[PDB]
A paper describes a structure:
FLYC1 comprises a homoheptamer with six TMs (TM1–TM6) per protomer and intracellular N and C termini. A glycine-containing hinge (G575) splits TM6 into two halves (TM6a and TM6b), and the β-rich C-termini of the FLYC1 protomers come together to form a hollow cytoplasmic cage.
C7 symmetry expansion followed by focused classification and refinement of the peripheral region yielded two distinct classes with improved density. The two classes are referred to as either ‘up’ or ‘down’ based on the orientation of two cytoplasmic helices that extend from the transmembrane domain (TMD). In our dataset, protomers favored the up over the down class, with approximately 72 and 16% of the symmetry expanded particles assigned to each class, respectively. The molecular model of FLYC1 was initially built from the best-resolved of the two classes, the up class, which was the primary subject of our structural analysis unless otherwise stated. In the up conformation, the TM4-TM5 linker is parallel to the membrane plane, while in the down conformation, the linker swivels towards the cytosol. To test this, we disrupted the R334–D598 salt bridge by either mutating the arginine to glutamate or mutating the aspartate to lysine and determined its effect on channel kinetics. D598K mutation rendered the channel non-functional, but remarkably, stretch-activated currents from R334E mutant exhibited a drastic increase in open-dwell time in both macroscopic and single-channel currents. Effectively, the deactivation time constant of the channel was approximately 40-fold slower than WT (WT: 0.477 ± 0.285 s (N = 6); R334E: 18.5 ± 5.2 s (N = 6)).
Numbering used by the authors: 186 to 203, 222 to 242, 264 to 285, 290 to 354, 507 to 751
The structure:
């Protein structure tokens, strides 16, 4: 309740009106004055507030063996807190920077449409539901590629808190040296035993944030398996297979694989292999090449004009193996579209063989009947 905060402010004012105790009350009150001064923001406000409190306390302030020591305790506790706030602020800034690397521009058009719609809803308002439902869909689409960062933040924070506890224990002088030595000794033993798990976690972090072979929604190829990335985390990546089975891969194994990424690929190519009889006249082979050229040229929304036909080999004297190399106008992120276009090309090849009378026969077999 703002009223309670205001009451506390009033109480502090009363303490001053009725001076170190009042100054202390002003700090104890956790006054919103810093927020007003500030009207990353809240990490900055805390940092400033702590800094002011420390400076005030030191300026505000016989029994060196008995009570003076409490002043040392307080001095250093406040300092530890300020160190903590500082590191906290640094952490936040760096993680925000990291997160920006996960912004995807694939949503640029959706973002611009949403900005326009929300701008007009501020003045022409009095369709609207679609705008808000699309806004929600976009916010989730963008937040889905930042889940690894949120996880890293939790991990880093836990480490940071522990580091600050240790700093407090040391800087205030509360810890003694025999316990510090036993503490460090046990930590080394723990590292010895569980260090290998930490190595794995760290390597997974490098894979996800530095190597970064894929993002969410990309269609990737791993060990010949074409899979869509559903989500990314620090320890695991979740993929959908072509039949939509959900598959969980340890990042520790993906870190050692060659990963294809269709989303990021340039227009991809393809191959149609076939065979014809050895006796097919070279003239029909020439006609086949011309017919194919015309087909591809009549369908430039699907095919680039560059293609090659390669004659590979003569098997016995019966078969000629050939292959047609073509180039699609798309990459293979939309796999179904790729197959539909290829399917039409295969049927065109069928048609050409029929029209040009291209066949394949089996070698003849000689029979001798004994009776
Ligand atoms: C804080 C240390 C925990 C030990 C595991 C190291 C990774 C930090 C925890 C982040 C979650 C990793 C991904 C698991 C899947 C999920 O979160 O749903």
């Amino acid at each position: 309740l703002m009223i309670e905060l205001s009451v506390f402010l009033c109480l502090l004012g009363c303490l001053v009106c009725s001076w170190f105790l009042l100054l202390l009350v002003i700090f104890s009150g956790m006054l919103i004055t810093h927020w007003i001064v500030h009207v990353l923001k809240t990490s900055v406000e805390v940092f400033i507030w702590i800094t002011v409190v420390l400076a005030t306390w030191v300026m505000l302030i016989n029994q060196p063996h008995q009570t003076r020591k409490i002043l040392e305790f307080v001095t250093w506790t406040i300092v530890t807190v300020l160190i903590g706030a500082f590191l906290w602020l640094v952490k936040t800034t760096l993680l925000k920077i990291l997160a920006s690397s996960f912004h995807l521009n694939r949503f640029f058009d959706r973002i611009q449409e949403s900005v326009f719609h929300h701008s007009v809803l501020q003045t022409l308002a009095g369709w609207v539901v679609k705008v808000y439902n699309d806004q929600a869909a976009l916010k989730h689409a963008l937040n889905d590629n930042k889940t690894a960062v949120k996880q890293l933040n939790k991990l880093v924070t836990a480490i940071l808190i522990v580091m600050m506890i240790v700093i407090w224990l040391i800087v205030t002088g509360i810890a003694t040296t025999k316990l510090i030595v036993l503490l460090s000794s046990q930590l080394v033993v723990a590292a010895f035993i569980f260090g290998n798990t930490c190595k794995t976690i760290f390597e997974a972090i490098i894979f996800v944030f530095v190597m970064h072979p894929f993002d969410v929604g990309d269609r990737c190829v791993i060990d010949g398996n074409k899979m869509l990335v559903e989500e990314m985390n620090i320890l695991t990546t979740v993929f959908l297979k072509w039949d939509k089975e959900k598959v969980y891969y340890p990042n520790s194994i993906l870190c050692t694989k060659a990963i294809g990424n269709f989303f990021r690929s340039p227009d991809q190519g393809d191959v149609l292999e076939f065979s014809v009889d050895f006796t097919t006249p070279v003239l029909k082979i020439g006609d086949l090449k011309d017919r194919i050229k015309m087909y591809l040229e009549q369908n430039l929304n699907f095919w680039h004009p560059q293609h090659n036909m390669v004659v590979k080999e003569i098997e016995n004297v019966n078969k000629i193996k050939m292959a047609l190399f073509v180039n699609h106008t798309i990459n293979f992120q939309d796999f179904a579209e790729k197959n539909r276009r290829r399917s039409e090309l295969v049927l065109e090849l069928k048609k050409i063989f029929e029209e040009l009378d291209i066949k394949y026969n089996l070698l003849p077999q000689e029979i001798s009947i004994r009776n």
